[PDB]
């Protein structure tokens, strides 16, 4: 079996503005096999009501998924995505950068 490590991007749907409702996205891609754990985190805590896209894959057979939830960003709050996969030594946490 050829295994592949997930790529991870954490970002918002629309340009973030404090006080305005928005969507927080965690796009994981390029991984194999398909079993994967993905959490969206608010100040280190797992957010509820996180949905995800239907499992699909790319030309090279690697899988991708979008995990997403409503959020309203501000100055106070820190957001992140934590991903676990058999290819990782432990979960990988990527912080939300409002400029990426």
């Amino acid at each position: 079996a050829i295994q592949r490590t997930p790529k991870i991007q954490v970002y918002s749907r629309h340009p973030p503005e404090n006080g305005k409702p928005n969507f927080l996205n965690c796009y994981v891609s390029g991984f194999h096999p398909s079993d994967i754990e993905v959490d969206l985190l608010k100040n280190g805590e797992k957010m509820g009501k996180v949905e995800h896209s239907d499992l699909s894959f790319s030309k090279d057979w690697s899988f991708y998924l979008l995990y997403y939830t409503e959020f309203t960003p501000n100055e106070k709050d820190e957001y992140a995505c934590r991903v676990n996969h058999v290819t990782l030594s432990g979960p990988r946490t990527v912080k939300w950068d409002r400029d990426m």
């Binding site: 749907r13 969507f23 194999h32 398909s34």
Partner: protein, 277 residues
């Protein structure tokens, strides 16, 4: 657009001791998902995943459900067969992926038909472009090739890919035209973030575009800095659109020697952008 595609992507994953393999299939027209099936759902059936699909009547959904359940049974059998071909234990989970579908060219004919499989993330077997022959990726897959050659499988796929596959694609393009036939150009802008007193990150953004295909390249003195550019994978907005950015770190005094070039279907002319303080 002049050309369009339809694809079905199925994933079958065994789980020894925990019941039958899980089966998921998703359908896309171009970069737009339009259906799904998940064997682990409460009452598994093919379901719409685009609003324009909701107008298909109940007999459409019943037939698609019948077809995916039939495919699922064959893929569970295949998993068994392949476990044997590779001399593998019954203890481990394995994955069978399939892709099938058709590209419609501007002459209204089949540009390319596909039917191919992967086992544990590696190429296994693929229908060739002539839709009359197979490529096996290894010796084990030659077992499958021999059986499919004897059973006339390629001709069955040829008939589907040149007929119903395209007929369905044409119908979806009509029913979904307001969104499927609309090329949404990227909203673009350049941001600037000092990383020191002497250098800054120039980031070129493309947002809200459809379809996903796009080119985003930073230029300096009219050629591309592909090696000094951080270019992220094109990513979904979650609203049916896509996003991408590319960034370079440059000396403060050379900032205006940099331009970002953006090409996309929905743009009349390619954009050349710059940091506009």
């Amino acid at each position: 657009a002049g050309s369009h595609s339809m694809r079905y992507f199925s994933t079958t994953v065994s789980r020894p001791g925990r019941g039958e393999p899980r089966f998921i299939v998703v359908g896309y027209v171009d970069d737009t998902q339009f259906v799904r099936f998940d064997s682990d759902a409460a009452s598994p059936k093919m379901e719409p995943r685009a609003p324009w699909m909701e107008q298909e009547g109940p007999e459409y959904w019943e037939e698609q459900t019948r077809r995916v359940k039939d495919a699922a049974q064959t893929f569970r059998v295949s998993l068994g067969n392949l476990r044997g071909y590779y001399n593998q234990s019954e203890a481990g989970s394995h994955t069978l992926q399939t892709m099938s579908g058709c590209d419609l060219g501007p002459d209204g004919r089949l540009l390319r038909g596909y039917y191919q499989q992967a086992y544990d993330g590696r190429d296994y077997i693929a229908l060739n472009e002539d839709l009359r022959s197979w490529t096996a990726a290894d010796e084990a897959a030659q077992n499958t090739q021999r059986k499919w050659e004897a059973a006339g499988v390629a001709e069955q796929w040829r008939a589907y890919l040149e007929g119903e596959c395209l007929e369905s694609l044409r119908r979806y393009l009509e029913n979904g035209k307001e969104t499927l036939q609309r090329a949404e150009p990227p909203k673009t802008h350049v941001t600037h973030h000092p990383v020191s007193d002497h250098e800054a990150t120039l980031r070129c953004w493309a947002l809200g575009f459809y379809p996903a295909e796009i080119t985003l390249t930073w230029q300096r003195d009219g050629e591309d800095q592909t090696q000094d550019t951080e270019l992220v994978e094109t990513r979904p907005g979650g609203d049916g659109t896509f996003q991408k950015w590319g960034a370079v770190v440059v000396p403060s005094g050379e900032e205006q020697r940099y331009t970002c070039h953006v090409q996309h279907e929905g743009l009349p002319e390619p954009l050349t952008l710059r940091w506009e303080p």
